[PDB]
Design a protein around this ligand. Structure first.
Ligand code: FMN
Ligand code: FMN
Ligand code: DTC
Lengths: 217, 216
């Protein structure tokens, strides 16, 4: 159908069926969704852990303890589990990797246009690094943009999903060694198919009216 | 198919002033803004949709100084949405959300209404008092909306560009957002590209999955 149908009909799944796996093609398509999300200046300030085995999901599920025990079941029972990570600092080696990938994909005709896109990236990166001191927050903002893109995308592939903020970030970071690699875990997204125990599957979707949230000029 | 539109969508650098959104598309854009997910269904956002030429000129005042190159995008596109975040998560908004969830029939019992208001307040209180990051937590949810929106309009057949290149302090003052309790974050012109757009025929570039993705 159309994406409005998908947007109105998708939901946060509260229980997954562990026997209902992603097809081999959907498993590749969810990775394509992760990579091809936009970001500010194409900065792509992210890493993804995609857990598809029982071991790998159990390693992710260490993060759902303490206050966050209600999220353990979803991390273990979903087919694939995506951990969305931000960079800890925006470094010049990574700003170079972005410009040199844009070059190799053939986006600049002139070597002057290569320099003009590196300068434009630098003006944005240095605004957040040197002046406003919020580069961790700026990069995290892009990862959340990615999550939004990902949630509608997987729903349009006919897959179920739930975004999770309810996990321990220090525990997940320690398990995959993210801090020394230069990353922090932000959102965990289990993807798969819902079970009959998903009570949110049949409940109506609720949002604030547009006369509170939206102004037309 | 959604993979086709994810691979085929572009950030458009120039818009056609004469190509307008249909009445159907204008409504569908507002629907996508409204029905995006957020943490705890907190929905900590406001949207300004500028469709008149007077409204789009008020938005374009934010791109005056350092960002003159972004003014043409805000003026020529059919609809221009400014995504705004809440400055503080107050108890009136938390009650507005749970009462709307109640009126829409999401709770079987008044106990489950209480347990959802409690489960929201736990996460909301954690972010202001303990982690000191309530403004950026809410800003994160609005950025999640932008991601939902961009793929959504791409799949409607419409061109979009997300813009951080504006002056948020000028936009905030222009629409009175500070005293209303909101701050401007992203401006997204929606429309169709002009016949002089260089980005539309240009290949997409992303880093390879062997850099960005670990499988376990
Ligand atoms: C960033 C983020 C974090 C969330 N964290 C959780 C979570 O820890 N557990 C859960 O069950 N739902 C979680 N949700 C789901 C929200 O409760 C849900 O998106 C919201 O109530 C709207 O419902 P819907 O997604 O069914 O439209 C989260 C949503 C977002 C966007
Ligand atoms: C939050 C955000 C802010 C952006 N700001 C600008 C901007 O001010 N000007 C611009 O020309 N492009 C801007 N972009 C577009 C990016 O350069 C673009 O998303 C990126 O190069 C990837 O290209 P694509 O969107 O065609 O896939 C922004 C993107 C995002 C997601
Ligand atoms: O509906 C919710 O949305 C959230 C959004 C952001 C952060 C935290 C939460 C929650 O704790 C719950 C409560 C919640 C609940 O009351 O019961 C459940 C039973 C099974 C699986 C999951 C849940 C929940 O997440």
């Amino acid at each position: 159908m159309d994406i409005i149908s998908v947007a109105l009909k998708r939901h946060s799944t509260k229980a997954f069926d562990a026997s209902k796996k992603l097809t081999p093609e959907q498993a590749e398509q969810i990775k394509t969704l992760l990579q091809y999300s936009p970001s500010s200046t194409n900065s792509q300030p992210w890493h993804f852990i995609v857990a598809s085995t029982e071991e790998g999901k159990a390693r992710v599920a260490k993060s759902a303890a303490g206050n966050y025990v209600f999220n353990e079941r979803k991390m273990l029972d979903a087919s694939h589990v995506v951990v969305f990570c931000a960079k800890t600092a925006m470094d010049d080696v990574w700003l170079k990797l972005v410009v040199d990938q844009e070059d190799a994909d053939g986006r600049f005709a002139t070597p002057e246009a290569k320099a003009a896109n590196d300068k434009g990236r630098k003006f944005f990166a240095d605004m957040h690094r040197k002046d406003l001191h919020d580069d961790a927050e700026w990069m995290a903002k892009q990862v959340y943009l990615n999550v939004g893109n990902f949630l509608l995308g997987v729903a349009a592939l006919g897959l179920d999903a739930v975004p999770i903020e309810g996990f321990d970030a220090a525990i997940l970071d320690a398990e995959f060694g993210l801090k020394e690699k230069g990353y922090t875990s932000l959102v965990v997204v289990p993807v798969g198919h819902h079970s009959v125990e998903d009570f949110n599957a049949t409940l109506p979707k609720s949002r604030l009216p547009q006369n509170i949230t939206l102004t037309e000029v």
